[PDB]
Amino acid sequence: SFSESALEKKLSELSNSQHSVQTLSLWLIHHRKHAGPIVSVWHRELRKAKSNRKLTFLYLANDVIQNSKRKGPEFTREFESVLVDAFSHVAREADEGCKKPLERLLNIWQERSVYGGEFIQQLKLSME
Amino acid sequence: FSESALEKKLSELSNSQHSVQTLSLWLIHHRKHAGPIVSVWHRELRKAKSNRKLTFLYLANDVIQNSKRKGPEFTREFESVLVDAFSHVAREADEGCKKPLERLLNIWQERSVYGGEFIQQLKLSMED
């Protein structure tokens, strides 16, 4: 049975596996009469989710949208309202996250004086 | 020590604390060959798959930090290649960063999940 409490919980348990994604997508398609609330809760929990988990939300949307087409256009329509914000948000997090380990590695070398300040700056500059 | 043997250990190198620190110890044992080591290390870094390249930098980090109590040679030797090394690693991270997002949009465009107008709108969002 559908509830927002149940959805929020399932979303909090979503793993970056195709199984996790397709399992949840099925439940949502089953509950597609609630496509409005579902997409709204999805968006909310996406923005709230830890940085490493946000991409998986977009793949969940992918599975839902393609698999629901043969049922009705309600999910395609509902997702359309939030996807530009969702893609913009994830792309922002990506731009920040992809080189974060490298940034952090230079901070460690800075902290520990592994190399002088001038050279650390060169290293930092070399990444942009 | 052999450049051959090093190339092997380098192919077998993983992201575990054990794998990195074990290889680092061997290299510090063979610090008389610091020149050759950094040259081979740099060659293999560039040929390594993108998600392995951070692990090469972590090996350099461990060699550099731990070698210091033995002499300045590994610090000096790495210093002559690390600007090039970070630049390369950073560049590859930048290239691959948003490929998952781009693939979702490429699937949707082809399979007509949305139209070009909206598709291009999501495309622009990745800049955002």
Per-residue 3-state assignment (H helix, E strand, C coil) for B79-110: HCCHHHHHHHHHHHHHHHCCHHHHHHHHHHHH
For residues A49-80, one letter each, b for 16 or more C-beta atoms within 10 angstroms of the residue's C-beta and e for the rest, the string is beeebbbbbbbbbbbbbbebeeeeebbbebbb
Q: How large is the greatest C-alpha to C-alpha distance in chain A, in angstroms? A: 63
CA-closest candidate to residue B71, choices B43, B18, B33, B119: B33
Least Cα separation, residue B55 to chain A (angstroms)? 10
Cβ-defined contact of A122 to B61 (cutoff 8 Å): no
Of B61, B75, B97, the CB nearest to A98: B97
Chain B CB within 8 Å of residue A119 CB: yes
Nearest CA in chain A to B56: A102
The CB-based long-range contact list for B9-16 (8 Å cut-off, 24+ gap) reads B10/B40, B10/B41, B10/B44, B10/B56, B11/B44, B13/B52, B13/B55, B13/B56, B13/B59, B14/B55, B15/B54, B15/B55, B15/B58
Q: Strand, helix or coil at B117?
A: helix
**Distance between CA atoms of B41 and A64, rounded to whole angstroms?**
45
**Using alpha carbons only, how large is chain B's radius of gyration in Å?**
20
Phi, psi of A82 (to 5 degrees): -125, -5
Number of alpha helices (DSSP H) and beta strands (DSSP E) in chain A: 8, 0
Residues 6+ apart with CB under 8 A from A21: A14, A56, A59, A60, A63
The domains located in chain A, with CATH, are: 1-128 (1.25.40.90)
* Technique behind the model: X-ray
| B90 in contact with A, Cβ within 8 Å | yes
DSSP, res A1: -
Instruction: Tell me the Ramachandran region of residue A49: left when phi exceeds 0, alpha when psi lies from -120 to 50, beta otherwise.
Output: beta
Distance CA B84, CA B42 (A): 9
- Tell me, what amino acid is at B78? F
Instruction: Give chain A positions within 8 Å (CB) of B52.
Output: none
Alpha-carbon distance of B91 to B127, in angstroms, equals 17
Among A90, A103, A118, A121, most B C-beta atoms within 10 A, so best to mutate, is A90
- Contact yes or no for A75/A39 (Cβ under 8 A): yes
- What CA–CA distance (Å, rounded) separates B81 from B87? 10
